[PDB]
Amino acid sequence: XXXXXXXXXXXXXXXXXXXXXXXXXXXXXXXXXXXXXXXXXXXXXXXXXXXXXXXXXXXXXXXXXXXXXXXXXXXXXXXXXXXXXXXXXXXXXXXXXXXXXXXXXXXXXXXXXXXXXXXXXXXXXXXXXXXXXXXXXXXXXXXXXXXXXXXXXXXXXXXXXXXXXXXXXXXXXXXXXXXXXXXXXXXXXXXXXXXXXXXXXXXXXXXXXXXXXXXXXXXXXXXXXXXXXXXXXXXXXXXXXXXXXXXXXXXXXXXXXXXXXXXXXXXXXXXXXXXXXXXXXXXXXXXXXXXXXXXXXXXXXXXXXXXXXXXXXXXXXXXXXXXXXXXXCXXCXXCXXXXXXXXXXXXXXXXXXXXXXXXXXXXXXXXXXXXXXXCXXXXXXXXXXXXXXXXXXXXXXXXXXXXXXXXXXXX
Amino acid sequence: XXXXXXXXXXXXXXXXXXXXXXXXXXXXXXXXXXXXXXXXXXXXXXXXXXXXXXXXXXXXXXXXXXXXXXXXXXXXXXXXXXXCXXXXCXXXXXXXXXXXXXXXXXXXXXXXXXXXXXXXXXXXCXXXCXXXXXXXXXXXXXXXXXXXXXXXXXXXXXX
């Protein structure tokens, strides 16, 4: 775990290689990686960093990697934070030099505490490690690390919000037009990315770009941490190549029971937000990210939720929105409506009191709700809401027929 | 109603470091964090002086109090059982554990023991879904606990 495992993994062995590099060389180096965002944005990782292209501004730039993802799990991001922290650390040091930022801050998940501590402590061994700092790693560019505990915002998750959390002042999205994402949070240039990107990018660079990159369909580059939670015997994290069989994935899970088979029905592929699936749909994955969209899939989170056949469709999805209910940050006047309208609206369906049309109506709300937004997180949450109507609601439309039963049940 | 951040302040003083040049906002987050340790159920009086250390107007700090879920307004059972009620965990059937647990614990899901070692929370996503049920006890963590097992877990602190 701590430095020896850290020494032991032989992290930073590259780092020495790193000193010699080659950062412009590194940066294209990703492009061959053609590293897309691991969080789900997908923009060229090279593209994102490249965007810095800093030249000279008075202020220091800064880079930070989320360590915080609340997506509702599976907690893949957290697990990565725990097992081989340093490896993340090295990646942090290595990449950052690429952008040529003086130092980096990593902002962690609020729930974690004891979990958080090890990361700094591994972080502590770093100065102790003496790999880089001051004059560093035979590299003039400086190195600094700061990690900040957190308030606890799923809202804090938005990039504008994440940069803002560092701001620690009523996090909201900064203003979308204005970025220039790099400038100027914490008062200056600063690019951001999901942690897996932060670390994995470090290993790939050390490795020849092709080995990681060659792996999978050219829709998706290299490898991914998939995690699953379901009404099946095995749930957890499985580090797997992009583009494999879902049902094959189901088999790795040893998911219970069967599938399609006893019982249905749907899986929310990414995390929760992307469109849910159907039993017929499941044969399709193929979990390459590009693969999902055409489906209207979009397993950006890479943490599956199996939602079992023997349950109320309205019942699970509805419980799910609430979280969206908790979520609203407040920056958009409309999204207060956004959670509202849905959640209160959502409940009626779940109780089964409400009349036929309202199902249709909700749909209307969805697009308008989706009409425009500050976020983002909010938009994504709504969109997942949408697919609910098709398929499962398409099933729920029947489920609502069950509401009819409530209607029959009325007297 | 007279909180003092002085003796542990030197530790607090470092917190001052984290940003560069102007502003102490970065300290904000740190500061409140320091405080919850100082007293839980932290109080307005504590904030204001914290603002002085902070050097910002109360409402400014006050805006901060709203937003972060973490800071706690009054008092909690020193035991503060954060019980996740979100889908995934729900998908865990967890919910039954809490209900069974509430009966065992003794107060509506909303309240805390008159004994006051504990203070339940309905919590939303604890960001450990693969591990559900996940229970965050105080600073610490408990993972997928049997109802009998959950009772046993409550027990030991209870001692």
Ligand code: SF4
């Ligand atoms: S959509 Fe909601 S959560 Fe997103 S920025 Fe707007 S108010 Fe905040």
Ligand code: FES
């Ligand atoms: S957003 Fe244009 S009026 Fe407030």
Ligand code: FES
């Ligand atoms: S749902 Fe309970 S931890 Fe994510």
